[PDB]
From a paper:
Here, we study fold transition between distinct β-barrels by protein engineering and structural biology technique. Here, we discover that the previously reconstructed ancient DPBB sequence could also adopt a β-barrel fold named Double-Zeta β-barrel (DZBB), as a metamorphic protein. The DZBB fold is not found in any modern protein, although its structure shares similarities with RIFT and OB. Furthermore, the reconstructed OB fold could also be converted to the four-stranded SH3 fold by a simple circular permutation. Thus, these ancient β-barrel folds (DPBB, RIFT, OB, and SH3) could be readily interconverted by a few feasible mutations through the missing-link fold, DZBB, indicating their significantly close evolutionary relationships.
Residue numbers in the entry:
A (entry chain F): 5 to 55
B (entry chain A): 6 to 55
Amino acid sequence: GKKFVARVVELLHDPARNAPVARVRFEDGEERLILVPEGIKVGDVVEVKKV
Amino acid sequence: KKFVARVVELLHDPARNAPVARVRFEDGEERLILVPEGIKVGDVVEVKKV
């Protein structure tokens, strides 16, 4: 359907994992923390999608 | 590459439009993320940049 997207607003570091966690912002103004891939920058948009 | 995880649980909170899914990543780590409507338990989701 419509692409499920969120804007990356902050990039944090998870020390347990050596991996980035982005603070993201949904269309309704909700903000959550997600594991993201490498190469994500603040200001990008990420999609969650079935494979 | 392809950053993926398998939906283990899925819950519709009447408080938001999108459902909350508990996903299992590569190493076994589990977290709660918002998924699109129509994700069912057992699906694999991908987090990618657009």
